Design a binder for these strands. Structure first.
Ligand SMILES: [K+]
Ligand SMILES: [Mg+2]
Ligand SMILES: [Mg+2]
Ligand SMILES: [Mg+2]
Ligand SMILES: [Mg+2]
Ligand SMILES: [Mg+2]
Ligand SMILES: [Mg+2]
Ligand SMILES: [Mg+2]
Ligand SMILES: [Mg+2]
Lengths: 137, 126, 206, 86, 164
RNA sequence: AAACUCCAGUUGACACAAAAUAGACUACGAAAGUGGCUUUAACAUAUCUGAACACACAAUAGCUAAGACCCAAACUGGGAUUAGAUACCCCACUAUGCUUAGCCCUAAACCUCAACAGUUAAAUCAACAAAACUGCUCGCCAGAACACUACGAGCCACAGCUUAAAACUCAAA
């Protein structure tokens, strides 16, 4: 059977399973990759928080939070605390274009979790609020 | 504005360098410039602005292979103008000087010295 | 120079010319045919097709030379070789049955191995940039380390703390020490490899 | 917010190749124009500047395509000389 | 009086150790005729006590000294102009008192004698302030001195001291 | 660094604000302007020209009354910075940007091309801009500066807008 790049539909029954569970039952790792910080929260499919880790909660301060290594460490910490609650497979939902967009996922993988899908949910207004003016540096 | 004819015809410096380095890394993080550039995985070491703001030298780390170095150099030189345009269009800086991609080989000395130091004989007590 | 740039250096190797034509590659055949056209310098006094020729010992003798006195320098070299040979024979006769398999008596092997044990691989380049002087490590080329081994040996043997001990005897003792990874020349190599290990951070100033 | 989740901007991993999935997602977001929109929305672009930029980009594309067409059309003549000597 | 020559812009650049004409970040009035005009508009300074702020090269200082003042107190923030002002003082014995400090924090009420203090209701008390300061420093200074006039303290302990 | 920790992440509810992609299109309108969806009204004139002032309009900014306030933001405070710092960076927050009823009447309000009708033959044609011209009408211009000024007059405008000089001076502009 040809691999489908598209995620499974909740309604349409599918045979894809991960440790016996359907796609819509897998825990979700929400990564928020800001410009100066990366925050990772693992939640259950029913939206029950299991683990949380940010670059600041891992000891990094000021500019050191906005690096790849800090996001990787936060990912490892989140993956460890999620492993301690029975999480193996995760669906990654990444929001933002910060330096830790990919390093947090790397840290999650090195912490033992298996990523089955990647979703981007970066906020894109259809021209709502007015952004701030450019910096005159 | 008759485009056919147009085509036919210091503390501040350090902050600007840091800003430009971050912006250039973020530009190279995606296929925004080009897929061919994205596939090469270029890493930048630093950004240096000339004292009179006449050029922006972006020092990129070289690899060991020479054919890959030449290809990456060609792609970077062909993509410099587009990256300048993107930097000015995103309003990271209102005016950006021409971007010059310069090779960086400083780490070669440390690498080779450590390679030899691994096999060197320091005798008793190291 | 009294030689025109046309003149090429001679190739004294005697077995090179005896190579059968079949073994020659087209590049080598071309080079041989080219050499006919070229002018060749007169072979200097020195290197010969002799089977006992050894370029390393010749260079060492030339480096011990003082005032063009090649007779005395070669005399000292042959005396050193004889002294090393006699000391090895003396230690071979007095050795047990099993220890006689691990005693090298060939003085040429001893000389080559002793010089090879003194070659440093990493050296320093004096460089003053910021108004203060800085050593920086560098990789030494093979020629440079080969030269440094001989220079250290000769300078150690010319020391004045050796009062009235004749040069052949001093040099034989130093060569036999360096053959076994001992002596002040090996210590000089080690104090260079260590004092270039203390300055790896300056390696970025190359 | 009111839409179903895990349908938009979602990529499945093939045989644990997370890097390939991430790079495919980056390509999708780039060619859909979302990356440039996000980067251009960080600071407000004035309407006159926005219009000038779009006009410049459109005319640059047109000029570049015309130049490429001319070069490709004239490439056919670039072959070995058939009347060498004369 | 035989005063030393006014420094040129090249000498100023070397004194500030800038080696260039673009990193100056300062403007100077190196024309003694304009400084003479300013000191003339400041009024009659014969045997007067003048408090000078932000001299720099010293064109205003020279113009005040040429006027027959009694004692000129000069407060300068940048140490690098103090050698030039000391040469100026050596030229004019006893007419120049150089102080290093900020005009925003320097205390003028103690500088001059207590015999120059005249009543507020009388004419201005023979003490003048003259200044060509950076425009980033003159507005805070005038606000501070307006407060002092409201309290009749600071430079105005002597009376209705005039400012130019 | 200040600031916040009634903070932050997921989830749900939730605008008097602004309208990704389409648009690589070049449309509508007298111009100014107009680019989220639906509906109702609706885009003058079967010769052309015809106004500083007549009659109706005029981006942005600004002013009266009321209202809304997410975000942005002149000013105003605070944080950080040389040796008189960054006006510039960071944080907070006004007038203002929005709606309703009135003012004000200015723009590089520009295609820097007055409206209609016609021609492509001539030497094409000072230059550059945007190929060169013809007929007809209205508007406007006759050295520079004084002067987008003064005075007079008009205006819901009150150091505001429109119209707009003279003297002295110069050989140029
Ligand atoms: K225009
Ligand atoms: Mg009409
Ligand atoms: Mg009229
Ligand atoms: Mg209006
Ligand atoms: Mg308004
Ligand atoms: Mg408001
Ligand atoms: Mg008309
Ligand atoms: Mg005139
Ligand atoms: Mg007027």
């Amino acid at each position: 059977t040809k691999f489908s790049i598209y995620p499974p539909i909740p309604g349409e029954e599918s045979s894809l399973r991960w440790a016996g569970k359907k796609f819509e039952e897998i825990p979700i790792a929400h990564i928020k990759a800001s410009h100066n910080n990366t925050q990772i929260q693992v939640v259950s499919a029913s939206n029950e928080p299991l683990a949380f880790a940010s670059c600041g909660t891992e000891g990094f301060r000021n500019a050191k939070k906005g690096t790849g290594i800090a996001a990787q460490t936060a990912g490892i910490a989140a993956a460890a605390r999620a492993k301690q609650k029975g999480v193996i497979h995760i669906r990654v939902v990444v929001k933002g274009l910060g330096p830790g967009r990919l390093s947090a996922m790397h840290g999650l993988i090195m912490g033992g979790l298996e990523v089955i899908s990647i979703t981007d949910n970066t906020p894109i207004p259809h021209n709502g609020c007015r952004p701030r003016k450019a910096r005159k540096l | 504005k008759n485009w056919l004819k147009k085509f036919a015809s210091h503390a501040r410096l350090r902050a600007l360098n840091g800003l430009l380095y971050k912006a250039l890394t973020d530009l190279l993080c995606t296929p925004e410039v080009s897929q061919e550039l994205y596939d090469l995985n270029v890493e930048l070491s630093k950004v240096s602005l000339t004292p009179d703001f006449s050029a922006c030298r972006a020092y990129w780390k070289t690899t060991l292979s020479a054919e890959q170095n030449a290809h990456m150099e060609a792609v970077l030189q062909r993509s410099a103008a587009h990256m300048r345009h993107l930097l000015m269009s995103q309003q990271t800086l209102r005016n950006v000087p021409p971007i010059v991609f310069v090779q960086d080989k400083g780490n070669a000395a440390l690498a080779e010295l450590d390679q030899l130091l691994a096999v060197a004989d320091f005798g008793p007590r190291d | 120079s009294r030689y025109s740039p046309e003149f090429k250096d001679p190739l004294i190797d005697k077995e090179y010319y005896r190579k059968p034509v079949e073994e020659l590659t087209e590049e080598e055949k071309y080079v041989r045919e080219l050499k006919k056209t070229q002018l060749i310098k007169a072979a200097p006094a020195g290197k010969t097709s002799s089977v006992f020729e050894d370029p390393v010992i010749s260079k060492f003798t030339n480096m011990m030379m003082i005032g063009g006195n090649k007779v005395l320098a070669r005399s000292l070299m042959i005396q050193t070789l004889e002294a090393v040979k006699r000391k090895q024979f003396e230690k071979y006769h007095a050795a047990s049955a099993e220890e006689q398999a691990t005693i090298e008596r060939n003085p040429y092997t001893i000389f080559h191995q002793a010089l090879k044990n003194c070659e440093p691989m990493i050296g320093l380049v004096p460089i003053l940039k910021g108004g203060r002087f800085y050593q920086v490590p560098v990789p030494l080329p093979d020629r440079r380390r080969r030269f440094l081994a001989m220079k250290w040996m000769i300078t150690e043997c010319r020391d004045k703390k050796h009062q009235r001990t004749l040069m052949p005897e001093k040099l034989s003792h130093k060569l036999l020490e360096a053959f076994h990874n001992q002596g002040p020349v090996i210590k000089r190599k080690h104090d260079l490899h260590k004092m270039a290990e203390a300055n790896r951070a300056l390696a970025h100033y190359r | 917010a009111k839409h179903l989740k895990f349908i938009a901007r979602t990529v499945m991993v093939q045989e644990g190749n997370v890097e390939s999935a991430y790079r495919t997602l980056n390509r999708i977001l780039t060619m859909d124009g979302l990356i440039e929109d996000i980067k251009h929305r960080r600071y407000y672009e004035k309407p006159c500047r926005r219009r000038q930029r779009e006009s410049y980009e459109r005319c640059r594309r047109i000029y570049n395509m015309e130049m490429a067409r001319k070069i490709n059309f004239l490439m056919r003549k670039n072959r070995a000389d058939p009347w060498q000597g004369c | 009086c035989r005063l030393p020559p006014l420094p040129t812009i090249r000498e100023i650049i070397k004194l500030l150790r800038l080696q260039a004409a673009k990193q100056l970040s300062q403007n100077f009035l190196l024309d003694l005729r304009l400084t003479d005009k300013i000191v003339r508009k400041a009024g009659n300074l014969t045997n007067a006590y003048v408090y000078e702020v932000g001299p720099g090269p010293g064109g205003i200082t020279r113009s005040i000294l040429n006027a027959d003042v009694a004692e000129l107190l000069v407060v300068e923030k940048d140490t690098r102009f103090i050698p030039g002002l000391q040469m100026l003082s050596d030229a004019a014995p006893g007419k120049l008192r150089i102080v290093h400090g900020d005009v925003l924090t320097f205390k003028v009420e103690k500088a001059f004698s207590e015999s120059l203090k005249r009543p507020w209701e009388d004419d201005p008390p023979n003490v003048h302030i003259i200044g060509n300061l950076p425009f980033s420093v003159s507005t805070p200074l005038i606000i501070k001195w307006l407060e002092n006039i409201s309290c009749r303290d600071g430079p105005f302990v002597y009376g209705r001291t005039q400012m130019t």
